[PDB]
Symmetry: C3
Subunit: 362 residues, 3 copies
């Protein structure tokens, strides 16, 4: 009657409400949330980002646009050089070289009260690499620099004749990146790189900022190497099935031969443009787990020296800011919260339920 | 006796202690706490901050101080020009114009392997606006720029005759802001702006940093439009009831006529000084819970071109860091914690209390 | 039998499992965790850091290396000047002076619509100080600046004759720090300082970033004064018991007399080099509680002025970022979690246990 019906109403209310927090909690766990922890890691071992230094983009490299303009053709159709036998595609892209074999890079990873900074030229030296911007110089930047103050930098230097033998380069295309399945150097140096002058001995300063992501079903991060493989493979696949040529330009993996004819080379170069401009959206592999960010500011520093190209890249801050996305609702939290909901919207305990089941079997 | 007295002591202890966590928890909820969560949003659509570009402040604009010094008066009392019929307040503030109708602004929101960057001059063009610093040029900067690398900028240019027709401006007052009820442009450009030289084609770089606040009773936020309206209304109200003049200068809203007499104009201009210097404290409206911060650093980049004013504003980082203040102790947390306190400092449950009340009515 | 044995099994399961969360919780509390909370404090009263401005390190001060070269002694063995009576160690380091009596510093902590910025030259003036780099100029930088916009800076100026009387200094060693037991100024200015040129009126910009650490048994922070005392005492102790000289150079506390002989002075100077290079690792007192970080960027700003040394230091951002490490598992959390574990892996409550003890004593 009255009392039993009201007891039934109370029990149904408690169960239904206790079925509205457990159901919501399980739905929350299924669509797992993610919070962000930000830390400031002070490390006395800074990992130099790989530096790709290119000319301007062929048509703006007023080294290449001069030699090409000497052969009866002009920048715009610079790729027609391949028509005549004595010019091949590799020669054309060597024609944009603005560096000179003696390109060095020292590591000034400290200072002293005598003899100023501590010079260390033993770090991996630059090597030439073919990029869509021409023939660039890539700094391996293999080992990490010991952070011994704000005067901790890498000085890249080139000493080609600075006299009136030819028009001299005005700009260079810097690009800071990471290693291995080279597409950052070979494709994206023209786009993501800073165009800076070389009239004066410039200086960069770089702060590091890592953005770690949480690997989860609805947004799976893939470590850097496989992301680079995804991006480069997609880029070349779209480049080949966009001109049907089945050939490569000097900035592409040695998969198929170098088609030495302007028409074919023109198709590949234009397809390269189209793909690299918008490879971000039509790719499939999502962001990396680790997302390094080099906040590159400009500093005046030291003073000048008479030399062709001087580039001091400073790392005056050792506090690499890390921002990590993480799973904030692991299963243990779900179990504990379900226990809490049952225990504070009902009378059920775990030992209570086990004893009830024991009584079930008597 | 012993047993019952000690049982009473235990029950009173449990209740009083269970009345010291629930009371403290409710006090904590009343004085709501606020925690800060920081995220790094990578957006490929960056919203340009509106740019107000002024001369130096009348007395430092060595365009205005030259024309005014030609009429028998000097900078300091430049506002006496109104005394003679042929000069009005609008003429005086047009006299400080350092720009030239052909002031343009292009949006270079990418690059290419051929044809360098992607020029897009269709974005909203600058318009002249009267500010306390003279007659400035405001870049509407309406639509957002697609972030296609570090070479994503807005190049504002002016090409007035760079020859010996008159003394030329040495520097300009930049100011990065937002839109609508214009007070940032018209009042605070002299104070909050970067004074940078125009001798060489300079370049800015802007990082974005949003600071969102939690709208709460003890610290309520008013969105950007309402904050701007509050601030500007207070500024002009205090400006008018500081000289009793009931007239305006060209940087004020068209409410009352223009101050066509030096004395009156001087009173309004000094009152503007006093108000804008310390309007932050004497206002009443508190901060916005959207608080955009433009970290403006300087970057060398590209090269020079023969042109009067060249200002490239770069947005080379697309990771807008957002620091959001939020309510960390919502009512649900209070209820759950009260339940926990009762259940682990007492024997009371929710279904238990419901059954007890049922027994109350039997 | 069956049912009692199964009840015993269930009770043992609940207790042991309830002994695997309470034990884990207590172990977690013992090795206390620490989370980082980050806030963006908008401070309208900025505490400018102390600035030590030195020449380059003796051997690069082409003021000192010129005067020494005039006495038949060359840079590298500049410390042999002590051999003759006319030169003592104090004179040798007064000989590296690149500043001149009238070294002033103004505080431009605002702007106005008339008369440009608000000049406040009353703030504490620089004083000369003996450092390992020679005789530097230290800015007391005592009181804080009122942040009245982007144009809030400290302008340090020196107006020594800028004519052909002697070879002029070309760059200087800046260093931003804090106060009291001076070792940052006297030892670490050569190492941690920015080498920037003085050919043109340069400008710095300082963003503040505090990193507060949580004082805890496994990593105890010490206030700034105590850390400075630790570092300086260790540095001087290692310096003295590295040459056995029992004498000091002008950059050391007035404990023992000055080394008036080249051999002794050279031993101290090399010992200072060795200690300051690697005092970070062989010290004992760990990091400070507060860790102020001055993100030092460069700006072009205002314009040029004819003066020997001009150094504007701008504080254009008032949002001092703070990252505080804190104890996230205080004892109250441990007690509450133990209560939860008992209540949802058992039937035990606090009032339940108190009543059980009541029954025990009857």
């Amino acid at each position: 009657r009255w009392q039993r019906a009201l007891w039934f109403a109370g029990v149904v209310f408690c169960f239904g409400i206790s079925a509205h927090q457990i159901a919501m909690h399980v739905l929350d766990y299924l669509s797992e949330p993610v919070a962000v922890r930000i830390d400031f890691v002070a490390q006395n071992e800074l990992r130099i980002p790989e530096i790709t230094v290119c000319p301007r983009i062929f048509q703006q490299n007023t080294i290449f646009t001069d030699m090409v303009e000497k052969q009866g053709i002009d920048k715009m159709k610079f790729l027609d050089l391949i028509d005549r036998p004595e010019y091949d595609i590799m020669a054309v892209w060597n024609l944009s070289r603005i560096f000179s074999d003696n390109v060095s890079c020292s590591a000034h990873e400290g200072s002293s009260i005598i003899s100023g900074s501590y010079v260390d030229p033993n770090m991996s030296q630059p090597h030439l690499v073919y990029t869509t911007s021409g023939q660039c110089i890539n700094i391996p930047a293999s080992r990490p620099l010991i952070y011994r103050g704000v005067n901790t930098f890498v000085r890249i230097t080139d000493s080609q004749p600075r006299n009136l033998d030819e028009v001299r380069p005005e700009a260079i295309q810097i690009y800071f990146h990471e290693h291995h399945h080279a597409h950052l150097s070979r494709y994206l140096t023209g786009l993501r790189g800073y165009i800076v002058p070389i009239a004066n001995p410039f200086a960069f300063s770089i702060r590091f900022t890592q953005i770690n992501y949480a690997n989860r079903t609805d947004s799976p991060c893939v470590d850097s190497e496989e992301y680079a493989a995804c991006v480069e493979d997609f880029i070349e696949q779209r480049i080949y099935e966009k001109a049907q040529v089945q050939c490569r330009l000097p900035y592409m993996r040695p998969k198929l031969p170098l088609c030495s004819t302007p028409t074919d080379a023109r198709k590949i170069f234009v397809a390269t443009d189209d793909v690299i401009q918008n490879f971000e959206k039509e790719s499939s592999c999502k962001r990396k787990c680790e997302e390094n960010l080099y906040i590159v500011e400009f500093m005046h520093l030291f003073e000048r020296s008479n030399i062709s190209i001087d580039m001091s890249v400073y790392f005056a801050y050792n506090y690499i800011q890390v921002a990590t996305e993480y799973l904030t609702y692991t299963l243990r939290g779900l179990l504990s919260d379900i226990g809490g909901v049952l225990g504070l919207f009902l009378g059920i305990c775990i030992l209570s339920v086990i004893e009830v089941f024991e009584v079930v079997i008597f």
